[PDB]
Amino acid sequence: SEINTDTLERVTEIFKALGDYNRIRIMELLSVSEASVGHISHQLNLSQSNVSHQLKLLKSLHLVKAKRQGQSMIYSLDDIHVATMLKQAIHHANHPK
Amino acid sequence: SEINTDTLERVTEIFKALGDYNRIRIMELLSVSEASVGHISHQLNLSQSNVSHQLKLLKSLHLVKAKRQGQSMIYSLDDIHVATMLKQAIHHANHPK
Numbered sequence: 001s002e003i004n005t006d007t008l009e010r011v012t013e014i015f016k017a018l019g020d021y022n023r024i025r026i027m028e029l030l031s032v033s034e035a036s037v038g039h040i041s042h043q044l045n046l047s048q049s050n051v052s053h054q055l056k057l058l059k060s061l062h063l064v065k066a067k068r069q070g071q072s073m074i075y076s077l078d079d080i081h082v083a084t085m086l087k088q089a090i091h092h093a094n095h096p097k
Numbered sequence: 098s099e100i101n102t103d104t105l106e107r108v109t110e111i112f113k114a115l116g117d118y119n120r121i122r123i124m125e126l127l128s129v130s131e132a133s134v135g136h137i138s139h140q141l142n143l144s145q146s147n148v149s150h151q152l153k154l155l156k157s158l159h160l161v162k163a164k165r166q167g168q169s170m171i172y173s174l175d176d177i178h179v180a181t182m183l184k185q186a187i188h189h190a191n192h193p194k
């Protein structure tokens with residue numbers, strides 16, 4: 001329950017932030033496997049500056065989280081709701097209509 | 098599987114279209130119960146013109162569908178992936194961090 005105006009505004013901000021091709025590419029990468037900024041940048045052919053900027057935004061909205069491992073920051077989808085939202089959307093885009 | 102560039106572009110368009118407060122309100126209403134344009138308009142205090150415009154957009158992206166019942170067009174979330182995506186996002190926005 002607890003669907004009030006504030007909730008739907010935050011939901012709106014989540015979808016607004018995800019309405020970005022490169023952010024979707026970052027999120028899909030993290031949906032397959034957690035990764036560092038250097039690995040995301042290398043895999044997607046995006047600069048480390050840019051990846052870091054987008055991940056600061058995604059983190060502020062609780063869409064990714066980060067932990068320090070050895071020397072680096074490892075990012076992941078924040079929790080199972082974010083993973084489920086994303087994978088359900090990808091499958092829906094993919095399956096025939 | 099089948100995560101290619103086209104898929105992620107369509108995913109991007111889905112999240113872009115959902116990055117809209119009133120469209121989120123329409124989608125949440127439909128997530129509770131299917132409804133006609135007149136009922137959506139009345140419940141959300143949005144004009145029928147506007148509701149109809151937003152639903153044409155949401156339908157073109159396979160996010161809602163419509164059936165004719167009696168005299169009116171009844172809209173609903175397109176399938177279970179759309180409902181799941183939306184409700185998971187709402188819950189994630191709601192729960193504590």
Ligand SMILES: [Cl-]
Pocket residue numbers: 032033034076
């Ligand atoms: Cl992982």
Ligand SMILES: [Cl-]
Pocket residue numbers: 045046047050
């Ligand atoms: Cl870049």
Ligand SMILES: [Cl-]
Pocket residue numbers: 095
């Ligand atoms: Cl399916």
Ligand SMILES: [Cl-]
Pocket residue numbers: 129130131173
């Ligand atoms: Cl229903």
Ligand SMILES: [Cl-]
Pocket residue numbers: 142143144147
């Ligand atoms: Cl209006």
Ligand SMILES: [Cl-]
Pocket residue numbers: 192
């Ligand atoms: Cl939970």
Ligand code: NA
Pocket residue numbers: 028031032087090100
């Ligand atoms: Na995936």
Ligand code: NA
Pocket residue numbers: 003125128129184187
């Ligand atoms: Na709901």
Ligand SMILES: [Zn+2]
Pocket residue numbers: 091092093095176177178179
């Ligand atoms: Zn589907």
Ligand SMILES: [Zn+2]
Pocket residue numbers: 079080081082188189190192
């Ligand atoms: Zn969550």
